[PDB]
């Protein structure tokens, strides 16, 4: 690893110093990692995609919708998470303006194993175009646990642009937790990346309403 833990600790220290004390903001500020990869071609090279689950959640309150069956909706009443049924999706009747409104409403979607087949048939491909596609859930697993999991998901997918960005966590967390999460995210990124630590163009740490800080 070219990046060192003490340098991460230092840069996190002035980042939290700027975010917390000097210029506090009313909204909670998310810490962002913005990466750019180097000597890489989206068209020819394999398009890497991967996901990791952070231990402490970056975004506790981000909106999630659960497409679900009878059992999934009844459990979602206990979870307190917004849900529309298969009958509701049939109501929608593949109308583009309303489904675009739903896609801009909800950042994340969780769907059942049974209904994940016809989620494209009822809804179409505009979810894949946006990049928000429903994540599978089963009857055995806990919905609120997987809501916490999806809220803690970090995903790197190549697409077409050679620069990516993820949300490591909040400003308000503790410094060692922030250092550990940014280190494991960089390690996950270089694990997905071929010819690791040399196709890394630039790594940037930032806070929401904050200046950029360059880690190599």
């Amino acid at each position: 690893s070219k990046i060192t833990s003490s340098q991460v600790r230092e840069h996190v220290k002035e980042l939290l110093k700027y975010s917390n004390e000097t210029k506090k903001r009313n909204f909670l500020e998310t810490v962002e990692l913005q990466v750019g990869l180097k000597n890489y071609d989206p068209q020819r090279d394999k398009r890497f995609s991967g996901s990791l689950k952070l231990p402490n959640c970056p975004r506790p309150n981000m909106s999630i919708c659960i497409f679900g069956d009878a059992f999934d909706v009844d459990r979602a009443k206990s979870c307190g998470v917004d849900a529309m049924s298969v009958d509701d999706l049939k109501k929608l009747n593949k109308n583009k303006k309303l489904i675009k409104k739903l896609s801009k409403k909800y950042n994340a979607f969780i769907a059942s194993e049974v209904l994940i087949k016809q989620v494209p048939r009822l809804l179409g491909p505009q979810l894949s175009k946006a990049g928000k596609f429903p994540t599978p859930v089963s009857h055995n697993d806990d919905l609120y646990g997987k809501v916490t999991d999806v809220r803690s998901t970090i995903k790197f997918q190549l697409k077409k642009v050679l620069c990516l960005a993820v949300a490591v966590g909040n400003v308000e967390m503790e410094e060692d937790v922030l250092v550990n999460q940014i280190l494991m995210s960089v390690n996950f990124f270089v694990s997905l990346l071929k010819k690791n630590w040399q196709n890394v163009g630039s790594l940037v740490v930032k806070s929401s309403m904050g200046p950029a800080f360059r880690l190599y």
């Binding site: 394999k46 398009r47 995609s49 769907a111 194993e113 994940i116 494209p120 491909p125 979810l127 894949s128 175009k129 596609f133 429903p134 994540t135 599978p136 997918q157 077409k160």
Partner: peptide
């Protein structure tokens, strides 16, 4: 799931997705 930019997006049983 979608055909965009010459790259198919597919969906596996158990809900896995590949775009490669």
């Amino acid at each position: 799931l979608d055909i965009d930019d010459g790259f198919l997006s597919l969906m596996n049983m158990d809900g896995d997705t590949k775009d490669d």
